[PDB]
Design a protein around this motif. Structure first.
Motif, short mmCIF file in Angstrom:
data_model
loop_
_atom_site.label_atom_id
_atom_site.label_comp_id
_atom_site.label_asym_id
_atom_site.label_seq_id
_atom_site.Cartn_x
_atom_site.Cartn_y
_atom_site.Cartn_z
N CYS A 69 0.69 -1.09 0.05
CA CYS A 69 0.12 -0.02 0.05
C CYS A 69 0.75 1.22 -0.09
N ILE B 143 -3.35 4.01 -5.61
CA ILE B 143 -4.64 3.86 -5.07
C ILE B 143 -5.33 5.22 -4.96
N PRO C 92 -9.02 4.17 -7.20
CA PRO C 92 -9.49 3.46 -6.02
C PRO C 92 -10.15 2.33 -6.38
N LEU C 93 -10.67 2.10 -7.59
CA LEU C 93 -11.62 0.96 -7.75
C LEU C 93 -10.86 -0.25 -8.07
N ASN D 85 -7.61 -0.72 -4.64
CA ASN D 85 -7.95 -0.75 -3.34
C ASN D 85 -7.33 -1.52 -2.42
N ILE D 86 -7.64 -1.40 -1.19
CA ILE D 86 -6.69 -2.03 -0.16
C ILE D 86 -7.25 -3.61 -0.26
N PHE D 87 -8.36 -3.87 -0.49
CA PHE D 87 -8.98 -5.31 -0.56
C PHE D 87 -8.02 -6.04 -1.59
N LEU E 118 -11.91 5.73 -12.41
CA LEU E 118 -12.74 6.79 -12.35
C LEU E 118 -12.40 7.91 -13.54
#
Lengths: 425, 425
Positions: free
Chosen positions: B343, B350, B354-355, B358-360, B385
């Protein structure tokens, strides 16, 4: 009166401490929800009963997870929340347990609790008296000054995380004096409770000279108190918490020092605010930054810290089907199962709104609920993929925007989180 | 020749098994990367050397994490990958360890390995011979039929997860016969290796009547083989893997039966494909669905399953600073640290996207790399985005779209994941 004591003694004599504490929490939470419903202001349509029950649980469970804005509750409901916090704090529950064990060191713990609460309230009242900016802010928000002071003191000492302001301590991020005066209250609650209690016992023994105090000091295990350890363990508590706070401060200062959430603050103001946030991350809940705006690295650090088990649950704790059962109780399987359930319940929300209802946010909410911290990643409707103007961006946590099943799941997670260090044995 | 054996004996006699296996993996990975660079096709500018090194590592580490599309490698590079898979599979490394331990059951293990590889290759070749649809697909993709068959057999048996097709087994999701013929190859590799080996020893002992085979069968611990357990442990292996596969099939059939990734398939085709995916989730890597399109509940189930430690690492494995060290080795702290690093490296990605970043997704990639599974959440540039038309949606995994530091971190995570169940002791 005496009937309460008789019933409690009957419960303690037969049932396990876990069962009696579960009954205590359930009955007090239900009473708090009922009260919150009764003294709702008339004429204005308040929150649904589920939101009131969630607020009562989170107040009792000192988890600070908000479903209703704190400004939607009147002064009487605020005092009901204060009472729930007092009766649900870690120190108060441990004090009641010590009362009941001794009946079937008590004075020192009761004095510590009462004196800390009273001194915190008096200190915050004095600070609001001397500084008129906070009084102006409270007048703008139309919140009683003394009620706000008592609420803040009780929440900070009990490590709950609630404040009458809807934005929590965000309006007071510029007031570094208040943050420095509130940090000890949080550090005298759940965290650093054992070393502070040990120091209090030590000073009482030194001043009095009574051998009983020294006997209690050097035999911490004989009295059976969970939060009274040996000198080595208390030094470990202090060192571990201080090092974790310093690590969090270092990372947040490295990453989000120039972030928008701290814009308009002096270097000393930024340092004090970041230290306050780092202190709160472990288990306080109170925040001065919109945690959503923080970078992903800091969010992951927050998740790691709130996932770290409490040091009281670390020192005290430290055929194949038996191994499976032993592995199922590790604080991680429960989190995974609850996150899976929450993702199941919010499938429509995740599909429609992946920026706010993403899996990491649900993981963060579940970790916050189980750890009873209170950090919510929030919900900014400006981040919607589909542009919707019907939104009213609300100040309550992410959980308030979940489905009813999601709220019930978070309630169960908070109950299990408070009753942790007990389910393990 | 004999110099290699002398060097191996010298390494084994003095150094620990961990050190010699680490140097083995490092030197073989470097040789594979050098080869992949050497036989690169001329005239066409191939991938950067970092991508070739990542592909060589993932091929050796049987982790199947792709940084370059599999269609960018020639037949010679494909055979280099086949050789790396053969020399890096779990069964082959265990066989080499048994060789060196016995020198300082070998026949049965070598026979099992060679026979399984040869039979898998022959079976896949025969199936491609009888069914011309696969031949037409390979002709469309311009991939040698025999080379593809050998590559698929070696990857399925070694539980690596690579296939010459860039979309992995997605073009063959309709061919349920191939999936049902490949499932045993994956279930004869890392997973169900101990019970299958036990059954092989049992049938050899029954047919031959030699008391040595029965002695090996009933004294599994005397021979010292890691993957040869007692009847109860082997029955546990079978029961646990079958139950996990059934649970995964049940959840995926409940959730994504009507998803777009399975549109156009019969009910039997969907059932076989979902069973193949569930079998692969544990540790195969090969996928027939674009894992991104799956619902968040199924994605979290995948993450949980690939986070579950291998049953070989569970049966065999089952002052305060010492407790801290013991807690740091739990398979979770390393994952958290590596996810934090990833990260940190991808902060710009990120923030901008972010889509997909993302962190997941980073957590999923780190879990896949450490578990050597190979599931990648992917990267669909249509999910940006900001609308950017310069994208060329590539078939390689999410890791191929990370930064160079992210690729290095994933390489380190894969190396540590292969050397897991070793670093623990």
């Amino acid at each position: 009166a005496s009937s309460v004591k008789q019933s409690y003694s009957f419960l303690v004599c037969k049932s396990n401490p876990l069962v009696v504490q579960l009954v205590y929490f359930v009955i007090i939470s239900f009473a708090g929800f009922l009260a919150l419903k009764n003294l709702k202001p008339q004429g204005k349509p308040g929150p649904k009963d589920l939101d009131l029950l969630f607020t009562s649980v989170s107040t009792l469970t000192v988890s600070s997870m908000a479903t209703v804005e704190m400004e939607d509750l009147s002064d009487r409901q605020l005092w009901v929340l204060i009472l729930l916090m007092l009766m649900g704090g870690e120190v108060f529950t441990s004090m009641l347990g010590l009362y009941f064990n001794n009946a079937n060191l008590v004075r020192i713990v009761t004095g510590y609790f009462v004196a800390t609460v009273i001194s915190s309230s008096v200190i915050i009242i004095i600070y609001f008296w001397i500084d008129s900016d906070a009084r102006n802010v409270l007048k703008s928000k139309e919140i009683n000054m003394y009620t706000f002071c008592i609420f803040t003191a009780v929440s900070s000492f009990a490590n709950c995380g609630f404040t009458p302001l809807n934005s929590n301590m965000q309006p007071f991020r510029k007031n570094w004096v208040l943050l420095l005066l509130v940090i000890p209250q949080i550090l005298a609650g759940n965290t650093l409770f054992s070393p502070l209690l040990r120091l209090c016992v030590w000073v009482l023994g030194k001043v009095s000279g009574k051998a009983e105090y020294a006997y209690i000091l050097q035999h911490p295990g004989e009295t059976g108190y969970k939060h009274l350890h040996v000198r080595r363990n208390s030094v470990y508590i202090v060192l571990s918490v201080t090092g974790l706070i310093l690590l969090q401060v270092m990372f947040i200062c490295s990453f989000e020092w120039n972030s928008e959430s701290l814009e308009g603050m002096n270097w000393l103001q930024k340092l004090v605010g970041l230290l306050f946030q780092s202190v709160n991350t472990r288990q306080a809940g109170e925040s001065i930054l919109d945690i959503s705006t923080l970078s992903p690295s800091t969010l992951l650090l927050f998740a790691v810290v709130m996932y770290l088990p409490s040091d009281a649950s670390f020192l005290t704790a430290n055929i194949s089907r038996a191994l499976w059962r032993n592995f199922t109780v590790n604080k991680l399987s429960c989190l995974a199962m609850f996150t899976f359930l929450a993702c199941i319940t919010e499938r429509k929300s995740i599909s429609s709104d992946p920026l706010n209802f993403n899996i990491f946010s649900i993981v963060f909410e579940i970790i916050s609920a189980f750890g009873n911290v209170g950090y919510s990643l929030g919900y900014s409707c400006q981040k919607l993929l589909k542009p919707d103007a019907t939104c009213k961006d609300a100040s309550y946590g992410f959980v308030g925007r979940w489905t009813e099943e999601g709220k019930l799941i978070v309630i169960l997670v908070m109950f299990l989180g408070r009753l942790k260090e007990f389910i393990l044995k």
